[PDB]
Amino acid sequence: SYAYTLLQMKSVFPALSLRSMYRNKGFGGKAPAIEWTEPRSKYKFRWTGVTQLHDGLRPRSPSMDVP
Amino acid sequence: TILCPWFASSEDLRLQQVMHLVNISSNTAAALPLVEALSTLLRSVTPL
Incomplete structure (x- = not known):
C-alpha cells in the first residue's frame, strides 16, 4: 500500500529540517527586523532593518528529532 | 550564615x-560588538 506508507512519512522531511534547524551551540547570521504597524487592526507590516543573531535568539523549542 | 559573595x-x-579596554583592540571593529550588544537589548525591551 505504497500511498499509505508514503502518507505515514508525509511530515518526516519538514520535521528533520524546517521544524528543527538551529538548536545547536554555534548560531548566528542576519534576520529581518520586521515591525508590526502599531495600530494593530490595520495588519500592516514594515521591514525595518536587520537583526544579527545570537544564541539567545535560537529556538528554545525542543527539536523534532526524537519523534 | 549564608555567604553569597x-x-x-x-x-x-x-x-x-x-x-x-586594554584587552580589546582600539579599532572600530572591536568596539562595534559593544555598541550592538546594547543595541540588541535596546530593540528587545522598548516601547517605541
Missing part, C-alpha cells in the same frame, strides 16, 4: 574595565 567595590569594577 558577589559584590566588588567601585574601585574594583573600574579596574576591570580599563583592563577590558
Whole structure:
C-alpha cells in the first residue's frame, strides 16, 4: 500500500529540517527586523532593518528529532 | 550564615574595565560588538 506508507512519512522531511534547524551551540547570521504597524487592526507590516543573531535568539523549542 | 559573595567595590569594577579596554583592540571593529550588544537589548525591551 505504497500511498499509505508514503502518507505515514508525509511530515518526516519538514520535521528533520524546517521544524528543527538551529538548536545547536554555534548560531548566528542576519534576520529581518520586521515591525508590526502599531495600530494593530490595520495588519500592516514594515521591514525595518536587520537583526544579527545570537544564541539567545535560537529556538528554545525542543527539536523534532526524537519523534 | 549564608555567604553569597558577589559584590566588588567601585574601585574594583573600574579596574576591570580599563583592563577590558586594554584587552580589546582600539579599532572600530572591536568596539562595534559593544555598541550592538546594547543595541540588541535596546530593540528587545522598548516601547517605541
